[PDB]
Symmetry: C4
Subunit: 52 residues, 4 copies
């Protein structure tokens, strides 16, 4: 009763922290590598146009 | 009770997982769409400049 | 026992949820990466054939 | 601990291994495809610059 649901709420909270923490890390890596690809791309097109 | 509680756990954590998965799915699609639009735009600029 | 049985059930069910969400994101990442690689290599060969 | 405490610990552990693994594979996948794109982009910019 006070144990079954406190152990239910505890499982959910503990796994929610794991899931949230892994998710935010994936969110940051996608944003990081996409931002990085776009600087690389923007720089290279600037270089090509400035070399023509 | 033991089964009602287990169903509650699986359900609640399944809402979390699906929400996180959905936002990542959207993020991947957004950034990939941006990249495809950026690459096409830039190549069209190069082609009109050579 | 009703405790271990229910625990194995929680793990199995949620593992399928996670695997499904994982394999779907794996496929999306591979797909969008594959397209971007093909768009780049197509567009570069187009430039090179035009210069 | 209690049986419910050791059972809840085993649920969280087994699902944390699953979550982490699927996370780690997506981490390596995103890094891999971003690296592949950058290798392609940089080969192609050096080919364009040497061709104009």
């Amino acid at each position: 009763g006070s144990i079954i649901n406190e152990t239910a709420d505890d499982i959910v909270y503990r796994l929610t922290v794991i899931i949230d923490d892994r998710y935010e890390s994936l969110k940051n890596l996608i944003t990081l590598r996409a931002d990085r690809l776009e600087m690389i791309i923007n720089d290279n097109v600037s270089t090509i146009l400035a070399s023509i």
